[PDB]
Amino acid sequence: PNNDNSDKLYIWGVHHPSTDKEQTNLYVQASGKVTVSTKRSQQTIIPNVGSRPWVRGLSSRISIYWTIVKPGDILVINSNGNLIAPRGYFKMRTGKSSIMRSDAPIGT
């Protein structure tokens, strides 16, 4: 439950194995699913099995998703495999903050 004065940002993920062996070795079920939901929103992701290009040794991937839970609202997470779980939430704020791409050095 969000019982707080402010919005919560939850970051979570879904694991895409390279092989069915990998899938069942980790999660026992042959086919995973992840469902994350509030009262006014849901996202159900089915994990996909198969090879991707080697990156730092792996053919596997994780897909990242997000969910914002408003005060009074309630987060529910449902899964029978492949869930990369959140360990908590990020505070949300509003203001003048942004981001920029640059290689200019920083000065005093």
Partner: nanobody
Framework: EVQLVESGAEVKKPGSSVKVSCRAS???????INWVRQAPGQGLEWMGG????????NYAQKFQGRLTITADGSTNTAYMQLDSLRSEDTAVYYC?????????????????????????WGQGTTVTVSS
């Protein structure tokens, strides 16, 4: 903590096949379970290992084709099957594994990363190959 208990002594005709069991007294699946034998008058000989979690096997090449190491997760049991028994296979067969625990486990390392010093041994099963 965990103790391993192997099945009872057997006797086999040459050519026949033998299957020894290893029963853990607790969950013992995350790290490499090893089979190691000793024939009369010889030093210890490593047969191979399984990592129950992944079902992954490693065999000494000398036994490839007649050695099968197998595991069942629900009953906490590992098995060793050796076919085409010659008399050289007369030996005491031990099963053994490490006692390490880890708060953060690795789900994709190389087999060898799951092999650790063997500090929990079964009592050993004498298989004697004779006519």
């Amino acid at each position: 903590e965990v103790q391993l208990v192997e099945s009872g002594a057997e006797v086999k005709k040459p050519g026949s096949s033998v299957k020894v069991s290893c029963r853990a007294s607790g969950t013992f699946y995350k790290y490499a379970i090893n089979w190691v034998r000793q024939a009369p008058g010889q030093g210890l000989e490593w047969m191979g290992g399984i990592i129950p979690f992944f079902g992954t096997t490693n065999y000494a090449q000398k036994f490839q084709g007649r050695l099968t190491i197998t595991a069942d997760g629900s009953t906490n049991t590992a098995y060793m099957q050796l076919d085409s028994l010659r008399s050289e296979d007369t030996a005491v067969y031990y099963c053994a594994g490490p006692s390490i625990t880890e708060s953060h486990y690795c789900l994709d390392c190389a087999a060898k990363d799951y092999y650790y010093g063997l500090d929990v041994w079964g009592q050993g099963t004498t298989v004697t190959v004779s006519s």
